[PDB]
Design a protein around this ligand. Structure first.
Ligand SMILES: Nc1ncnc2c1ncn2[C@@H]1O[C@H](COP(=O)(O)OP(=O)(O)O)[C@@H](O)[C@H]1O
Ligand SMILES: Nc1ncnc2c1ncn2[C@@H]1O[C@H](COP(=O)(O)OP(=O)(O)O)[C@@H](O)[C@H]1O
Ligand SMILES: Nc1ncnc2c1ncn2[C@@H]1O[C@H](COP(=O)(O)OP(=O)(O)O)[C@@H](O)[C@H]1O
Ligand SMILES: [Mg+2]
Ligand SMILES: [Mg+2]
Ligand SMILES: [Mg+2]
Lengths: 370, 7, 370, 370, 7, 7
């Protein structure tokens, strides 16, 4: 068997090739206890990784080792990898090849260090490095389409017409859910609720996943919200306090299409789709219009596809038809596609050998993997 | 504050 | 066989490690005669210490060497510890390490002085000082919660989550049983009973331990007590006189909740616990709500737990359930709490060796103790 | 004859347009007696506000109507304004427009209430509500620069470039002098000094304002402070008893840079100032580096500018020259900057009219004030 | 205590 | 990042 690990900005999954569901589901955060140990009865480990931290997240300094799809802290990163293989997946890395996924347009130092770690720390028999978004299209059973990946650190748009994607039309935007989490909280201060620390940030993360939704008409909906009622919902905080949120339910998800609220000049997520498809050939444009695919945990908002379809329709000429594909389980499409690719017999020749890494060092990843 | 802090 | 000695504001407990109840249980008082011995000297010592003073409390001038958990006279204190080893436990202290309990937020000058002398007067092989509240949780066998340690001199609440204590949220209240006796010392004059001297104060200490109790609601009880005599209780004085006290039975324990009667600008113990838990993180507030640990001889009053639960529910959100842990043997919870630590093999590492004190001085206690 | 009043968490200043110094300088506290009056000849009032409360602070229960720049008691909030216009300024607000200040990132209901109460209780001709940090730069006379307003309850930092603000890069810290008073009072206890009641907070407020100072190298200093007594200073309490403080003189202001002592997970004031400008783009960072402006009564500390320039120098690139602007009168910069705006001729068009408030209501302030 | 209370 | 953003 071959192991599939898909490191994400906030959420990392792992499982086995051919499986329909990832085996391990825990967020990728390592925290260190700011307070001093008083009791000696228990272990009181130096650090905690994954679901272990969130259980005790009140007394930990939660840190995200990867930011915008870039591993800022390599010292913490191996802690997740060690935890994945021995605690969650409880398997020995030196018997099975493992595959890792990355966002496009990443620094060369990001994806050279992981190969060094894999062949020196865990001594995996083989390795592979594959773009995050391209694997999502495999999960949908298509090879000609454009994938709208939107996770926590990267929102990259890539058109894929054949078995390989076009690098020249890859547009990467650093606007994702984590920026959204930073955005509702500053707006949430308008209603009298203050959340500053990283511990309450996950509490902030929860409310977005449950109550935030995309409004079809932002101008009409805000006018509707001016009349009060019929939209405010009550949410219970882990403390026990119940909070009510009004217009902010749609305002934060709306920032995807109008980034002017967050203060960066890049256009909305609807607009960058149009730019990418302009950069490709005219003949391939027709196919990509009808094969638009959404992916990533950000795209989970209710009605996001309907508003997306409306926006691109205005920008696109009426001759070509736009069909947006939103599979129900697009949350794990990146991993699921990797399981299919790992299960393929043709892929036995695109593995990287340990001996081959020795001859070329960690620089072999640029030339072989893509 | 209502939620968070004392204010 | 490590030695556990617990110097309390009103009551000192000492024993051996690994036991269940303190071996020697005698009051923390040092008194001297105010008159002259007309008869020959058949053993009239300069000062009497322990239960000996209690037997002849009518002639001596009782003075507590410990006040509000602060030693105001280091001379009389040496007497109690000298009397403890050679008259109560009958063991030489040069062969076994000794444990001490200190209330939080105490001046550094107090804790350096107890160390300096013991390494010089009794020459203990090893030493350690621990928080009274911390050891109280150890007796309960738990790992997370807030402990209410209200003794004779001080009332301190220390919240802990999974062996980690938050130093910022430690609230120290200078309201304890000795003040409650003083409040009784002021209110009992309405019925004609007049007590003046500190020796006569010990009688007040007895009546509060037998007749005082916590009423469920003050406003209805005072109305009921002013309309009947069902709450009347008869107490016999040591001379043979009998006294009757009515509404004052519940009024004194009520002062722990409304210190405005004593004129203190501080708030009630129910409110102080609320401030501490609010000062704690939101993520950990859920766990400590159901893990409130009660300790100290002050809270021996009948119905205090039922009352204590009531106001917390009023202040806290109604969604959360409230549990007050009141073990029957919470009186010596600190001692039995300190007993098990001395029996732990892990604690043997953190002993303050004699050489460490020699090479550093009295300043080692601040670095090596919390 | 416009009125310039800048209500603060602990300190409010009131004066007239076109002047150089605030006319009225009194503390912003409303207090009520905790006892019952005995002498009927003296005309006892219900509550006392301002310096009158400070004169009788030993008998009153002082309360701050504003906490963290937020009005938690709107009833008391009217009382202070009632006292300002008719006792301190001795003028009628019905004929002059009045300008008011507030911290950024405040709840909209807070500014909603102030507009309604002043237009309905005092019935002024006009209002304008403007950011405290914004008014600070006007006193300096500059047009571009990062302003650090560390008041009593709010520590906020706002970047400005050529009169255009960046709402996304505004960072607010809820750590200011009042918290430092709380930190100073817990660290005075180690020397044996107890200050618990609210009246005893003001005396602690007095001790920091004269003896506390910022040390250039914290790590160097405690070794010096623990090796001699030259840093010790003697202070006299109003009751005649005299106080000596050693290492605590620099430790309390150090919490402004190391909030871990308070248990807060936020970044230091130097770090937050660095973090805020990192949120800005590269182009204006050079200019904003050389125009750093400090303000607020917290920044009164001797040597604070030398420490802030040293701290930012390590984080900032070495090529850049960091320039700290510390005008000697920066305590009253917010009010003095307010005098300029009320005196400006262009500003007369941005006054909110009674007709404008009549047609819309309290909601007009949100679209008409920043 | 020294300044404040009696302890 | 090195030149740009926080990463
Ligand atoms: N039900 C939901 N509604 C809205 N957003 C969600 C929901 N579930 C997850 N998310 C968002 O998806 C993000 C993670 O998605 P995913 O791409 O699977 O992981 P990663 O971004 O780490 O690769 C989370 O940060 C979360 O904010
Ligand atoms: N049954 C009781 N009822 C009321 N008060 C009690 C009772 N038992 C003890 N107390 C009081 O509680 C105070 C503190 O008790 P304890 O915690 O055992 O001593 P210390 O404060 O020295 O630790 C004592 O001063 C005592 O007067
Ligand atoms: N000379 C000083 N040294 C140290 N701190 C001071 C000094 N003067 C004032 N402060 C503190 O600064 C805080 C804010 O003062 P000020 O700016 O006048 O009030 P506000 O924050 O309401 O504008 C006050 O709480 C005070 O304790
Ligand atoms: Mg992802
Ligand atoms: Mg006790
Ligand atoms: Mg201020």
């Amino acid at each position: 068997a071959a192991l599939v690990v898909d490191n994400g900005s906030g959420m990392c999954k792992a499982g086995f090739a051919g499986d329909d569901a990832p085996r391990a589901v825990f967020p990728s955060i390592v925290g260190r206890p700011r307070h001093q140990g008083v009791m000696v009865g228990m272990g009181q480990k130096d650090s905690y990784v994954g679901d272990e931290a969130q259980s005790k997240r009140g007394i930990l300094t939660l840190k995200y080792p990867i930011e915008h799809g870039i591993v800022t802290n390599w010292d913490d990163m191996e802690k997740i990898w060690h935890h994945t293989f021995y605690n969650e997946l409880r398997v020995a890395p030196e018997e099975h090849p493992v595959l890792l996924t990355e966002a496009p347009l990443n620094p060369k130092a990001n994806r050279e260090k992981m190969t060094q770690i894999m062949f020196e720390t865990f001594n995996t028999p083989a390795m592979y490095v594959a773009i995050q978004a391209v694997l999502s299209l495999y999960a949908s059973g298509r090879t000609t389409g454009i994938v709208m990946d939107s996770g926590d650190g990267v929102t990259h748009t890539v058109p894929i017409y054949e078995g390989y994607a076009l690098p020249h039309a890859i547009l990467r935007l650093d606007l994702a859910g984590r920026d959204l989490t930073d955005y509702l909280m500053k707006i949430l201060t308008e209603r009298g609720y203050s959340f500053t620390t990283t511990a309450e940030r996950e509490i902030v993360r929860d409310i977005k996943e449950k109550l935030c939704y995309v409004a079809l008409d932002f101008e009409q909906e805000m006018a509707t919200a001016a009349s009060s009622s019929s939209l405010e919902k009550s949410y219970e905080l882990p403390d026990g306090q119940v909070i009510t949120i009004g217009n902010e339910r749609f305002r934060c998800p709306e920032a995807l299409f109008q980034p002017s609220f967050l203060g960066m000049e890049s256009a909305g997520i609807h607009e960058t789709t149009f730019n990418s498809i302009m950069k490709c050939d005219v003949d391939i444009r027709k196919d990509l219009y009808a094969n638009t695919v959404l992916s990533g945990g950000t795209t989970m908002y209710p009605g996001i596809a309907d508003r997306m379809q409306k926006e691109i329709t205005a920008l696109a000429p009426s001759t070509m038809k736009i069909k947006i594909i939103a599979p129900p389980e697009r949350k794990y499409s990146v991993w699921i596609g990797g399981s299919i690719l790992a299960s393929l017999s043709t892929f036995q020749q695109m593995w990287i050998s340990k001996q081959e890494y020795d001859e070329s060092g960690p620089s072999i990843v640029h030339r072989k993997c893509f | 504050w209502x939620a968070x802090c004392p204010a």
